[PDB]
Amino acid sequence: NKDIVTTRSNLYKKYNQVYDRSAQSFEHVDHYLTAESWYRPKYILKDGKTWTQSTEKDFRPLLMTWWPSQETQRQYVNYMNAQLGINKTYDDTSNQLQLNIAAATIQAKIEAKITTLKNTDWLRQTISAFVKTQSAWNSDSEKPFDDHLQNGAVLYDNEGKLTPYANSNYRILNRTPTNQTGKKDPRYTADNTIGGYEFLLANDVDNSNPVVQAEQLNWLHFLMNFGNIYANDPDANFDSIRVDAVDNVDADLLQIAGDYLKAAKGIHKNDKAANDHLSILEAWSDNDTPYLHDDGDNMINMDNKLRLSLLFSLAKPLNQRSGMNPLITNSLVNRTDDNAETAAVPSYSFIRAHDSEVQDLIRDIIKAEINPNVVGYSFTMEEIKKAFEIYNKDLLATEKKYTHYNTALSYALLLTNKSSVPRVYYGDMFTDDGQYMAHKTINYEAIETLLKARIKYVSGGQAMRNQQVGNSEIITSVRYGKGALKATDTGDRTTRTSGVAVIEGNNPSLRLKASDRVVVNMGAAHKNQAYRPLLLTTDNGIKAYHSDQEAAGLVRYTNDRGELIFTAADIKGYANPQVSGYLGVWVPVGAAADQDVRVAASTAPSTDGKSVHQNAALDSRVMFEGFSNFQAFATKKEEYTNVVIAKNVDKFAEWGVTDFEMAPQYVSSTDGSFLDSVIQNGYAFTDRYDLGISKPNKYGTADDLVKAIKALHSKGIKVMADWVPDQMYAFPEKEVVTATRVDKFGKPVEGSQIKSVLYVADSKSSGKDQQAKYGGAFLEELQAKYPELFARKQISTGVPMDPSVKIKQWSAKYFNGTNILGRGAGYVLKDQATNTYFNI
Ligand SMILES: C[C@H]1O[C@H](O[C@H]2[C@H](O)[C@@H](O)[C@@H](O[C@H]3[C@H](O)[C@@H](O)[C@@H](O)O[C@@H]3CO)O[C@@H]2CO)[C@H](O)[C@@H](O)[C@@H]1N[C@H]1C=C(CO)[C@@H](O)[C@H](O)[C@H]1O
Ligand SMILES: [Ca+2]
Numbered sequence: 001n002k003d004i005v006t007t008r009s010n011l012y013k014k015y016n017q018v019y020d021r022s023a024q025s026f027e028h029v030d031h032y033l034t035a036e037s038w039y040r041p042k043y044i045l046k047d048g049k050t051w052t053q054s055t056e057k058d059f060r061p062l063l064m065t066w067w068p069s070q071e072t073q074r075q076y077v078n079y080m081n082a083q084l085g086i087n088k089t090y091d092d093t094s095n096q097l098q099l100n101i102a103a104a105t106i107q108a109k110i111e112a113k114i115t116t117l118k119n120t121d122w123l124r125q126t127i128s129a130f131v132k133t134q135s136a137w138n139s140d141s142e143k144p145f146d147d148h149l150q151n152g153a154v155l156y157d158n159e160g161k162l163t164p165y166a167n168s169n170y171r172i173l174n175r176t177p178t179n180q181t182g183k184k185d186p187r188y189t190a191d192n193t194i195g196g197y198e199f200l201l202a203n204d205v206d207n208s209n210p211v212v213q214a215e216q217l218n219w220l221h222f223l224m225n226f227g228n229i230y231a232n233d234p235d236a237n238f239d240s241i242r243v244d245a246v247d248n249v250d251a252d253l254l255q256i257a258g259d260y261l262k263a264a265k266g267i268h269k270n271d272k273a274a275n276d277h278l279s280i281l282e283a284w285s286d287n288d289t290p291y292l293h294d295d296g297d298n299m300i301n302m303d304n305k306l307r308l309s310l311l312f313s314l315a316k317p318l319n320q321r322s323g324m325n326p327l328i329t330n331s332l333v334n335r336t337d338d339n340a341e342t343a344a345v346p347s348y349s350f351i352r353a354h355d356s357e358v359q360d361l362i363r364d365i366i367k368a369e370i371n372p373n374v375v376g377y378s379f380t381m382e383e384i385k386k387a388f389e390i391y392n393k394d395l396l397a398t399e400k401k402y403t404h405y406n407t408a409l410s411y412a413l414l415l416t417n418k419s420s421v422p423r424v425y426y427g428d429m430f431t432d433d434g435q436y437m438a439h440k441t442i443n444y445e446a447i448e449t450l451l452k453a454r455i456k457y458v459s460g461g462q463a464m465r466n467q468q469v470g471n472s473e474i475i476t477s478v479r480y481g482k483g484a485l486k487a488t489d490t491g492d493r494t495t496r497t498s499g500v501a502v503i504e505g506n507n508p509s510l511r512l513k514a515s516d517r518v519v520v521n522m523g524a525a526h527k528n529q530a531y532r533p534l535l536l537t538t539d540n541g542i543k544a545y546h547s548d549q550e551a552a553g554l555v556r557y558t559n560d561r562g563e564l565i566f567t568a569a570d571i572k573g574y575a576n577p578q579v580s581g582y583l584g585v586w587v588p589v590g591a592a593a594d595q596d597v598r599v600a601a602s603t604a605p606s607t608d609g610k611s612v613h614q615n616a617a618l619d620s621r622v623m624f625e626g627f628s629n630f631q632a633f634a635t636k637k638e639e640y641t642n643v644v645i646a647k648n649v650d651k652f653a654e655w656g657v658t659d660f661e662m663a664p665q666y667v668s669s670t671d672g673s674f675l676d677s678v679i680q681n682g683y684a685f686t687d688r689y690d691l692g693i694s695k696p697n698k699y700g701t702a703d704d705l706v707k708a709i710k711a712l713h714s715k716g717i718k719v720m721a722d723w724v725p726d727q728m729y730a731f732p733e734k735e736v737v738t739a740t741r742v743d744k745f746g747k748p749v750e751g752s753q754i755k756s757v758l759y760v761a762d763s764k765s766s767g768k769d770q771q772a773k774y775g776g777a778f779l780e781e782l783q784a785k786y787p788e789l790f791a792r793k794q795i796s797t798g799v800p801m802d803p804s805v806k807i808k809q810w811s812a813k814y815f816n817g818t819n820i821l822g823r824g825a826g827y828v829l830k831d832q833a834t835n836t837y838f839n840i
Contacts, residue, residue: 001831002840006065008096009073011104015043015051016065023840027059030163030736031840033829034760035131037062048112059120061127064107068832070096072134077102079130084109136826141753148744149376150673150819153199155746156812157756160738162837166812172208172250173198173746173816175796177283177291180251182796187294188287195285196247199744201674202684202729203763204816207250210802212814213794214779216725217256217801219688221778223721224264226691227709229774235713236706238721239277242661243299244683245726246283252794253725254281256801258298263786267298267611271601274611275618276718278421278659280348289332293345297610303347303420306331310351310413314506315404318580321506324475328464333419335477338462339485343419343614350423351410354629354663358432359675362630365390365402377675384679388433388630396442396577405580408446408542412502412535412585415450415622416479418462419614423623423661424451433630436641437648442577446535449544450585451622451655453534457498457587459597459616460523461485467518472510474571474582477502480523481588482597491525497591499523500534501564503571505582510573518566527562530555530589541578548589555589598656622656627663629681633698640700646711653715660712664722665691665705668698669730673819677729682722684729689770728810733764736828737812741820753825758837760827761818765810776806 002021006013018039019025025040026033038059046052067073071092077099078089084106090098114120131137145151158168178185178195188195198204206212220241222229227236243257257279261267267274279299281292289301309326316322328335332347352358359377365387366374374383394402404410407428414422429447431439460480467474481499484491501520512518522529532551536543545551558564564586573582598620612618627641634640641663645652652660664682667690671677677684680698687694692702699705709719739759741752748755765771783790783803790800807814829838 001834001836001838004066004838008100009067009103010065010100010107012045012107013065015045016041016107018042019055026840028840029734029760030165032736032758033062033838034827035063035134035137035829036128037829041065045108045111047115048108048110061123063127063130064110065103068826068829070099073099073103075134076130077106079133080106080110080126083126084113132822135824137824139820139822139824141825142741142820142822144749144751146743146749148199148819149201150378151375152820153204153742153744153817154739154754154759154820155742155817156815157738157740160756162758163736163738166735166737168206168209168813170209170797171206171816172796175208175250175252176247176285177251177254178285178287180795185287185291188290190286190290193285195287197744198248198746198816199742199819200245200248200726201676201819202727203731203761203818204727205249205725206814206816207253207725208796209814210794210797210799211805211807213250213252213256214790214801214803215776215807216253217260217782217789218774218776218778219725220257220260220723221264221782222689222774223723226721227706230691230693230702231706233706233710236709238709239718240279240659240720241723242279242720243281243283244664244722244724246281246288247285249726250796252796254292254295254299255792255794256789257723258295259789259792260786261298262611263789268296268606270603270606271613271615271617272603274606274613275601275621278612278618278621278718280720289345289347297346297612300346300348300421300612303332303349306349306420307351310410311357314406314409314581315351315357317400317405318508324473324504324506325466327413327475328466335417335419335462335464338418340419341485341615346612346614346618347420348423348623349414349417349420350425350625351407351414352404352425352428353423353625354425354427354627354681357404358427359629361391361402362387378673379675379678380672381678384630392431392433398575398577406506407443408535408578409504409506409581409583411443411447411450412504412583413477415454416458416477416500416502418479418619421618421621421623421659423625424655424657425625427628430628432628433632435632435634435639436644442541445544446542446578448655449534449546453500453585453587454622455598455656456591456595457500457597459483459498459599460495461487463487463521469516469518469571470510470512470568472505472507472573474503474505474510474518476518476520477504478520478522481525484523484525487521487523489524491523494595494597495525496529497588497595498597499526499588501531501586503566503582503584505571505573506580508573508575508580510571510582512568512571514568516568518571520564520566522558522562522564524562526558526588527560529558529562531558531564531586532589533584534587535583535585537574537579537583538576539574540576542583621658623659623661624652624655624657625661627681627699629675629679631679631698633680634700637700640696640704641698642700642704642708645708646704649711649715649717652712652717657717659718659720661720662708662722663699664724665697665699666724667692667695671730673729683724685724686728686730686732686765687769687771688728689774693770731762731764731810732766733762735761735763735812737761737763739817742817746816757825758828759825760823761812761821763810763812763815763818767809771810772808775808776803779803779806
């Protein structure tokens with residue numbers, strides 16, 4: 001209640017009283033005081049000598065003259081004595097007068113050191129360190145930890161009497177696509193659970209708040225007009241988006257993004273529009289794909305079934321590997337005989353991504369050889385570097401203990417499968433660490449060969465076969481050639497010189513019997529035809545054939561029925577750094593050097609109520625995830641990722657890349673509280689609009705980004721922006737909130753001292769950043785052009801988006817809560833007499 005009276009505390013107690021009752025003599029947060037707060041007293045004991053008359057800019061720790069309890073005063077006195085070379089300690093029976101005289105001595109010698117040592121910085125550090133020793137002011141009162149990635153979270157109370165500026169009518173949690181109405185959707189049964197959880201990392205954005213929802217749409221419009229807005233260059237806009245962390249945010253965002261793409265880009269009218277803005281989800285629940293399909297196929301999800309199938313049938317260690325038939329049937333699309341003009345559901349397919357099956361491997365290495373107590377993905381840079389030593393040796397072993405086997409086999413399937421958009425991971429062609437595109441992996445040659453051949457040969461219907469041979473099994477996968485959807489189609493000239501056969505085994509012990517025959521039906525267009533190898537497993541790796549002349553001596557022929565026939569002389573198991581099993585790829589002889597069997601999207605009207613259609617034109621696309629979490633930091637400008645991308649767009653065009661998925665371009669925060677802010681990938685940020693504008697991002701300056709987008713567009717490659725509405729990191733201004741310790745679903749942890757309790761968070765942006773410039777700056781334009789976006793009543797809330805408020809400054813009122821900050825349950829100071837919080 002406004003008046004810190006200093007009585008029976010410190011011998012010097014009438015000089016230490018507060019300068020005035022003004023708030024400007026206290027370092028306060030929302031007019032509360034913290035254990036680390038400093039204040040301006042009336043007099044300063046200058047050099048610990050003379051009670052200097054004035055105080056001006058002379059702020060001193062409040063813990064120098066005031067304490068919450070006598071026990072804390074004693075702890076402070078013992079601590080500060082040790083810090084200042086005063087060899088006296090006071091145990092739990094010493095009395096008040098002794099403590100006040102000790103505190104006076106400590107004050108005097110503090111002021112001596114302040115005038116000796118130039119500044120007060122050391123005192124800030126020493127006071128905060130002491131405060132961290134106190135359980136009411138550190139992690140101890142925030143325990144027990146839980147399986148939140150960062151050990152826990154607190155949820156901000158919607159009605160806090162002491163913090164009404166942080167109140168909310170929303171904070172509706174866990175409204176995943178499965179759980180969007182607050183009840184588990186009865187349509188979707190592949191996932192038993194509620195399909196996600198609200199609290200993932202750092203400060204959790206409340207995407208149930210209509211004002212926030214509107215600001216998310218503002219941001220989306222900004223990214224898709226980045227060229228126009230920042231550089232007045234319409235050739236430098238992002239073309240599409242990736243929706244990050246779908247299962248940790250309110251699913252209303254899916255309708256908002258879809259609606260926006262329909263209204264602003266017309267993706268629902270024809271395939272040309274849709275494919276010009278092909279947008280994706282990172283949505284891990286198996287309900288998300290049927291959900292997104294019922295929603296209109298306005299975006300596409302990953303095929304997680306196919307992914308797991310590749311992982312467990314090919315990538316895992318030999319003794320943990322599953323049988324091979326899942327590669328055919330355990331997918332969105334059963335590829336036994338895929339003869340459809342248009343598959344039932346669109347999707348993209350991958351084996352590794354910047355996060356998936358990379359940071360998992362680094363964590364495995366750390367947990368098993370460095371620090372067994374590693375928490376989630378909260379690595380230190382030192383742990384990361386020691387782990388990449390192990391990782392990089394394992395990559396080249398024949399017997400891998402940590403990294404994937406059979407990468408080239410995985411890509412042989414991904415890049416010749418029908419009915420999916422493959423997404424190539426950067427770190428599978430180039431090293432996961434090091435400078436951008438500086439070092440090829442051992443699989444670069446095979447993968448590049450596959451990408452080029454995909455342009456030239458991959459089209460038509462598909463047939464996958466699983467054949468038990470000798471002591472093991474193989475699969476064949478065949479594409480019939482352009483224009484041949486069914487195996488009986490005899491084709492035209494281009495059919496004859498396209499199509500492909502892939503043969504794989506996942507067991508190095510594979511031995512065929514002398515009587516075994518692998519009869520690969522190529523299709524009715526390929527009777528009595530010469531075929532040559534594209535990829536062949538060898539003893540030490542994979543031989544790639546880049547031309548018909550490079551393979552001139554290995555030609556073989558189909559019989560009169562269009563069958564290639566293989567025996568033990570052709571197929572056996574191998575064990576080398578690239579293959580644990582067997583891989584062979586064959587193409588028909590004689591395709592023109594410029595043969596291109598891809599197909600452009602039609603402008604014919606769409607008539608089935610979906611926007612994206614998995615047909616030959618979409619199957620003609622290739623997505624490229626163009627970064628690695630663990631890229632080195634550029635040492636000179638020519639090593640900047642976006643600079644290098646601009647310098648190699650010819651390479652991406654020759655690989656058939658149609659969609660370049662760039663890293664998130666937001667300037668990263670540097671708090672190091674998660675992997676993303678340690679290696680600074682772009683997913684941990686404080687300013688949604690700072691795309692390398694105030695400072696370069698890890699990939700270059702904003703002009704480097706503009707030039708990279710233009711260079712990609714100059715080859716017809718579309719460019720994808722990473723929409724990250726889940727969380728934000730490292731806000732520069734503190735705020736006092738009413739909070740409750742919770743699990744990642746928002747359920748309160750009992751036995752917790754944080755329960756409708758004052759808590760100090762970092763949750764205000766500066767008001768002088770890009771957010772303050774652009775926040776809500778396009779809502780009037782968007783409402784004017786597209787009123788129906790603001791008319792829709794969103795599913796989770798029952799109301800429209802609310803664009804009547806612009807978010808120029810983030811504040812706790814717009815967030816569900818935060819990961820625990822190690823500040824404790826009692827950081828906000830109370831008058832001990834009245835058990836009342838101090839306020840000004
Ligand atoms: C942090 C990163 O992963 C997050 O999701 C993880 C899931 O919680 C895992 O369980 C795993 O999914 C399995 C499902 O739980 C399971 O039910 C099944 O349906 O599918 C999986 C097993 O087959 O997947 C994730 C492991 O990475 C989170 O949802 C995801 O969005 C996160 N990655 C992006 C987001 C951020 C934060 O902005 C960044 O940390 C990353 O770099 C982004 O890529
Ligand atoms: Ca969330």
